């Protein structure tokens, strides 16, 4: 979500690289993977789908190189352009959710809560 002023324009590239190569440090490398060139305008928000591309049928929820998922990166395709009397710096908000093919298995306890003695 682009939370800038309406007079502000811009083009952004958001991307996804499936695992196995050097994590993208430049737009040039990022371009070669799955990507969306977002154009700022009346439709405030842009969605990039990270397609299920995996060797294993199910990945682990824990960190693990054998079941790793790849890299997400964002770059300026052109740049943010504003007119005069307009704020030249602004916030971008981001959201994540699962597509209808998403599924999970083997119920476990979360590391995200605990109680002391």
């Amino acid at each position: 979500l682009f939370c800038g002023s309406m007079m502000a324009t811009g083009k952004i590239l958001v991307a996804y690289a499936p695992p196995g190569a050097q994590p993208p440090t430049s737009r040039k490398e990022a371009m070669l993977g799955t990507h969306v060139i977002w154009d700022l305008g009346l439709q405030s928000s842009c969605t990039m789908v990270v397609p299920w591309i995996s060797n294993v049928t199910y990945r682990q929820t824990t960190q693990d190189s054998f079941t790793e998922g790849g890299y997400i990166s964002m770059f300026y395709q052109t740049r943010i352009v504003v007119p005069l009397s307009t704020p030249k710096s602004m916030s971008m908000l981001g959201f994540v959710s699962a597509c209808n093919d998403f599924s999970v298995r083997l119920l476990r306890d979360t590391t995200h809560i605990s109680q002391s003695a």
Binding site: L1, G4, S5, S44, P87, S91, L93
Partner: protein
């Protein structure tokens, strides 16, 4: 056909009409329109009071100002409307009351202004408090009425053990209740992003574990408004624009009539 749009709406309830030329569609919480208690779900046996147009209409609360330092605002329902005309009278003359709501949040600015408000409708919005003392927030403090309450960037524990303030201390990134704000989006909501829209419109059903309840003892819905992205304009480091909240009770019905409830708010 003709020229109809998502952005342009008219809402009319009772003798009140709202127009908006810059909306971002509208939300119906949980996919449920407000409805009356059906006979097969009824519990108090007494013939209900249904005040209709006199209570189911648009009451505008006092305006708040959004500035660069604003951490957030919150309201509870029915509490915010407790003094609003005949709705308030019906609420206090009856042991029981149920009501749905149309919530309309208003904030306009300019093509050169910037910022984004998250508007959330939370069922049972239990807030955290002041102290070491658990579940100690007083009734008068839990209930700000029309005035509403505010959010804070951090938790300052009410230290004076001798004469405790007994207030809520709602920290913004914890949604004032120990969870993270980013996940508040699972609640019925809209966003007022100034480049995109003037307002938010959320229709709320009556949500509770019971078909009807004491409106004076219990709030059903909480309206939380937070700056997801801070207000900004040109270079003026002290910008300020108004936010106005307007609410309408819907399908309001009351049971258990007797003398009026006069709560001590001091």
């Amino acid at each position: 056909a003709c020229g109809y749009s998502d952005r342009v709406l008219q809402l009319t309830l009772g003798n009140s009409t709202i127009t908006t030329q810059e909306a971002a569609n509208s939300v119906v919480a949980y996919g449920r329109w407000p409805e009356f208690i059906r006979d097969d779900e009824a519990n108090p046996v007494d013939q209900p009071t249904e005040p209709d147009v006199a209570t189911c209409r648009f009451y505008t609360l006092d305006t708040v100002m959004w500035g660069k330092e604003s951490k957030g605002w919150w309201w509870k329902l029915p509490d915010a409307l407790r003094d609003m005309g005949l709705f308030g009278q019906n609420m206090y003359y009856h042991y029981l009351g149920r009501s749905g709501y149309t919530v309309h949040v208003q904030c306009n600015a300019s093509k050169f202004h910037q910022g984004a408000l998250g508007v959330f409708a939370i069922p049972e919005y239990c807030l955290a408090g002041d102290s070491d003392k658990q579940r100690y927030t007083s009734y008068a403090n839990a209930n700000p009425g029309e005035r509403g309450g505010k959010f804070y960037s951090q938790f300052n524990k009410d230290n004076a053990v001798t004469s405790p303030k007994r207030e809520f201390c709602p920290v913004d990134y914890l949604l004032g209740c120990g969870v993270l704000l980013g996940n508040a989006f699972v609640y019925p909501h809209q966003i007022i992003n100034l480049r995109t829209n003037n307002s938010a419109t959320i229709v709320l059903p009556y949500v509770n574990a019971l078909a009807i309840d004491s409106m004076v003892k219990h709030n059903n819905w909480g309206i939380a408004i937070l700056p997801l992205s801070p207000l900004d304009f040109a270079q003026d480091s002290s910008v300020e624009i108004p936010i106005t909240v307007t609410i309408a009770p819907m399908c309001s019905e009351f049971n258990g009539l007797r003398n009026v409830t006069a709560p001590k708010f001091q």
